[PDB]
Amino acid sequence: MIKVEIKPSQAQFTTRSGVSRQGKPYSLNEQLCYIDLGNEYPVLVKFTLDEGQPAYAPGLYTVHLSSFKVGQFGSLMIDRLRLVPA
Amino acid sequence: MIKVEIKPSQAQFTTRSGVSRQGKPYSLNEQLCYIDLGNEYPVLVKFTLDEGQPAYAPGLYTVHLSSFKVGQFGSLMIDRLRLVPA
């Protein structure tokens, strides 16, 4: 299991916006977290939330299986970091 | 935890080869596995082994933390699927 932490200072998201190739508006909500990758300190990671999802609250989380997909070259990839409470 | 299985038929690797942009030879060893991504059946996934590593033997495995890195856009990515026995 991957240990993810949302710190008190990371309790909010920011939103970026634009327009797709054929004219549709979009909005993407991004939040920050710390992930323990086995180095001397956890590292800062950004991720995009799914549509209609609030920012994750401060606390400890692990990564859900739905974060992963098989890519176009037949290998595993992360689609979007989706979290569940520890 | 991600559940990975090496079937009896997947006990071997194949090797691809070539030459880098400035002339150095390389070899990459690739092996297949099945990963349970929560769909009705496990899916077929290819991955490259690290240098000097034998093919994983048939059996059940999970993914090691060293499989992950922060990418150039600040988000989590899989570098190479590295496995450890379940």
Swiss-Prot record, chains A, B:
- Record has DNA-binding as a keyword: yes
**Keywords, A to Z?**
DNA replication, DNA-binding
Q: Which GO terms describe its biological process?
A: DNA replication; rolling circle single-stranded viral DNA replication
Q: Where is this site: Involved in DNA binding, and in the dimer-dimer interactions of the protein-ssDNA complex?
A: Y41
Q: Which SUPFAM superfamilies match?
A: Nucleic acid-binding proteins
**What is the top-level taxon of the source organism?**
Viruses
One annotated GO molecular function is: single-stranded DNA binding
| One protein family per Pfam | Phage_DNA_bind
Q: How does it assemble?
A: Homodimer.
Function of the molecule? Binds to DNA in a highly cooperative manner without pronounced sequence specificity. During synthesis of the single-stranded (progeny) viral DNA, prevents the conversion into the double-stranded replicative form. G5P is displaced by the capsid protein G8P during phage assembly on the inner bacterial membrane.
Q: Which family does it belong to?
A: Belongs to the inovirus G5P protein family.
Q: What is this protein called?
A: DNA-Binding protein G5P
Q: Which organism is it from?
A: Enterobacteria phage f1
Gene that this polypeptide is encoded by: V
